[PDB]
Nucleic acid binder design. Structure first.
Ligand SMILES: Nc1nc2c(ncn2[C@H]2C[C@H](O)[C@@H](COP(=O)(O)OP(=O)(O)CP(=O)(O)O)O2)c(=O)[nH]1
Ligand SMILES: [Mg+2]
Ligand code: NA
Ligand code: NA
Ligand code: NA
Length: 326
DNA sequence: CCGAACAAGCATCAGC
DNA sequence: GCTGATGCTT
DNA sequence: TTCGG
């Protein structure tokens, strides 16, 4: 982390614009600048040097000059003193509380963890589970625990139907030594873009992971996307493990490669890659890559038989997952 | 200067 | 009930 | 907030 102080500042600015100002484009600009700087392999010595990188403009360059001179940013230090800003920023750390709900809660004088706990009745289901596991959800998962969880998920899925294929994506698939949560891509040959030949494909997997007490709570759940909570089992008399966020995405079997590209990320990598696709005349979602016609209307899905096929279409060199951690 | 900035599933709510 | 917008999330 | 045209 050559430039950890700079990228921390930019990330804190990003979070302020998202949570407090509700300025999504400023938030993306700071995150993008933080991303391009994190992979820059020199210790930055001036805002001018940083402004040579794409995504760092005049305003971020000036902030880097102030940071490098003083070790601080006056704008952030004032933001940190403001009670409303600090409280809104804090409340958004609860899963299910966003900028709108956080500002609504602070308006009614709900502005601390203890305030949240005594007003459970004012939370929706998702928010209540995010409050319940607030402490756990801020801990990272050592890859060794990710490996144990993987083994549980893949084996339980196989007991439901040997034709399911579960793939752990996210930062885990990118080779990270720790992960924020577990991301599972799921396919079944009964579910393709051409037909759904079995109902309850995702449900059966969820209920089986619940029966073996791996899934403990549900944040949201539909036919193709599950967002919930899981926990490794612990040995006799040992401390329990923290509860962990788990996301499961059922994707049409024939669209696996677009799906695993999507779910491997990173999120910024996906944004960069989809934006480049547009510049090249394609649009990419988790299902397909399609060309844009004369009027910018999406055309027919193109054939895809690997992740690299997608990179080829937009004329990017193939990047292994471990090189997508933007 | 100015328009564009990735794409979408689930929960919730207003309106009919 | 449905449609469509918005919030929040991946 | 940044960038391309
Ligand atoms: N097009 C897009 N795609 C996205 C987006 N947000 C998330 N994703 C995709 C890519 C993520 O890796 C994947 C998982 O989402 P997750 O939050 O778990 O990201 P990890 O890479 O695993 C970091 P960790 O803290 O969990 O370790 O979902 C998005 O806005 N736009
Ligand atoms: Mg993840
Ligand atoms: Na630049
Ligand atoms: Na939140
Ligand atoms: Na996730």
């Amino acid at each position: 982390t050559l430039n950890g102080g700079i990228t921390d500042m930019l990330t804190e600015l990003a979070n302020f614009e998202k949570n407090v100002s509700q300025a999504i484009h400023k938030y993306n600009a700071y995150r993008k600048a933080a991303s391009v700087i994190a992979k820059y392999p020199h210790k930055i010595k001036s805002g001018a040097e940083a402004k040579k990188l794409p995504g760092v403009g005049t305003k971020i360059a000036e902030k880097i000059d102030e940071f490098l001179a003083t070790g601080k940013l006056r704008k952030l230090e004032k933001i940190r003193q403001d009670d409303t800003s600090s409280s809104i920023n804090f409340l958004t750390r609860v899963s299910g509380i966003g900028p709108s709900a956080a500002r609504k809660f602070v308006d009614e004088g709900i502005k601390t963890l203890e305030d949240l706990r005594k007003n459970e009745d004012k939370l929706n289901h998702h928010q209540r589970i995010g409050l319940k596991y607030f402490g756990d959800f801020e801990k990272r998962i050592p890859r060794e625990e990710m490996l144990q969880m993987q083994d549980i998920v893949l084996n339980e899925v196989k007991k439901v139907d040997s034709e399911y294929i579960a793939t752990v994506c996210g930062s885990f698939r990118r080779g990270a030594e720790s992960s924020g949560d577990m991301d599972v891509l799921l396919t079944h040959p009964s579910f393709t873009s051409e037909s759904t030949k079995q109902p309850k494909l995702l449900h059966q997997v969820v209920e089986q992971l619940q029966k073996v007490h791996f899934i403990t709570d549900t944040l949201s759940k539909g036919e193709t996307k599950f967002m919930g909570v899981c926990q490794l089992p612990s040995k006799n008399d040992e401390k329990e493990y923290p509860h962990r966020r788990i996301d499961i995405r059922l994707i049409p079997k024939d669209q696996y490669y677009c799906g695993v590209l999507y779910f491997t990320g990173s999120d910024i990598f996906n944004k960069n890659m989809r934006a480049h696709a547009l510049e090249m005349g394609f649009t990419i979602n988790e299902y397909t890559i399609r060309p844009l016609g004369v009027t910018g209307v999406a055309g027919e899905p193109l054939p895809v038989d690997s992740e690299k096929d997608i990179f080829d279409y937009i004329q990017w060199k193939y990047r292994e997952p471990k090189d997508r951690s933007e």
